[PDB]
Amino acid sequence: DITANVVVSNPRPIFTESRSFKAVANGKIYIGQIDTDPVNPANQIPVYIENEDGSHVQITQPLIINAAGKIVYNGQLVKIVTVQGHSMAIYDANGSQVDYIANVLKYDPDQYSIEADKKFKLIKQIEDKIEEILSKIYHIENEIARIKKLIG
Amino acid sequence: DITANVVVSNPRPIFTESRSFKAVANGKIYIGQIDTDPVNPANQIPVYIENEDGSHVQITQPLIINAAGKIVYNGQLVKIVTVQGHSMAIYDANGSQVDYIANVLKYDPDQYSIEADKKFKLIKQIEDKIEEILSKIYHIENEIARIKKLIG
Amino acid sequence: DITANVVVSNPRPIFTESRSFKAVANGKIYIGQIDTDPVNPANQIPVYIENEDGSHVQITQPLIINAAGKIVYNGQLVKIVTVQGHSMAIYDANGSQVDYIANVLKYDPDQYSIEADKKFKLIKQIEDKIEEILSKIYHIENEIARIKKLIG
């Protein structure tokens, strides 16, 4: 057949209400240290827009949710990233809490390639070191054979 | 620049109809062994609410979907977990099948840290063992040099 | 307690408009090489329906989105896969661009088992090779002890 395990998916998040099927239109998102209350600025962590060229621009919290339920900045849809896993709290436009998640971690595709590069390197180092160890061993075995023959 | 590969996302699932843009309001979800029919109780696997403190309480199937398309128990939104990947079947409030997926596996963030801890330990064990092997080898090399000198 | 880190989730994607809370009804999706414009056929990559038995049938682009926001072929909901991470562009029924994502990578559960099998094998090979190296070393140590005793 063929091995094909990458699924066509929608990576752009949408945020909807908790009790009705509606977007959190003009809602607010706060992002903080895991297992903390991110509405408290002391718990907040840096958030960045990732631009199309892959650069990052730090922005202020809260994140804003549009009528589609999507995060926007300056009238445009944006992808927001952090360095680490994080807590999140979502509020609706009336200031009522929609949701709270203590620990959220979704990696974008760059993390997968970084990890794959790291793994590749690691395995090469171990295998290279094993091969070098075997070469040291076979040289020793040869020295031993020579000694044995020397002494009868 | 900065490396930031954690994307702000919405980890709370929503369940919607297959032919119209609507929540599966008062729908039902069944969870079972991979590649099985989970409506059959003999194929069902334990499901648990994961509470805010991280504890688990086993609950009965089906899981219930509210007007927002979100899983609820006892009038509150809940996160449901299983130990293993699983099949899932979704029915609407009229008893009509909405969807069936044979094999679903989404890990929450705790799995990532468990795996990272396991990896860290593993690599340390291999590297420690390599270093110990090299130390054994260099001691042997030294014994061999001494022998060589002894016998001319 | 119990370790349960598989979260009940909805793996079937839905595609919604960018400025209103609505499905991209009768929309179109194009899938291509990462960081390319997938509306250009020269940038497109093979897309396949993954059938219930796990087989694959290649289909033509664009992918079509129904009134629910879900991908359909021949009047039925389908799961679409590619071999590699990919770019994606979404258009609405009027030909207006809804979204563009340069690099999308979501693995279905089969990738996790392939990777787990590969990891298991790898670690077994390294550990087996370490054990064999130690056995070579202990045999050498024994030969050295014998030599030492022979020569005083």
Swiss-Prot record, chains A, B, C:
Cellular location(s): Virion
TM helices/strands, residue ranges: none
Organism listed in the record: Salmonella phage P22 (Bacteriophage P22)
Free-text comment about domains: The interdigitation of the polypeptide chains at the C-termini is important to protrimer formation in the folding pathway and to thermostability of the mature protein.
Family statement drawn from the similarity comment of this UniProt entry: Belongs to the P22likevirus tail fiber protein family.
Subunit structure and binding partners: Homotrimer. Interacts with the host O-antigen lipopolysaccharides; this interaction induces cleavage of host O-antigen. Interacts with tail hub protein gp10; this interaction anchors 6 fibers onto the tail hub hexamer.
Name of the protein described by the UniProt record: Tail spike protein
Summary of the function given for this chain in its UniProt record: Structural component of the short non-contractile tail. The tail comprises six spikes that mediate primary attachment to the host cell lipopolysaccharides (LPS) and display endorhamnosidase enzymatic activity, hydrolyzing the alpha-1,3-O-glycosidic linkage between rhamnose and galactose of the O-antigen polysaccharide. Digestion of the LPS brings the capsid near the cell outer membrane.
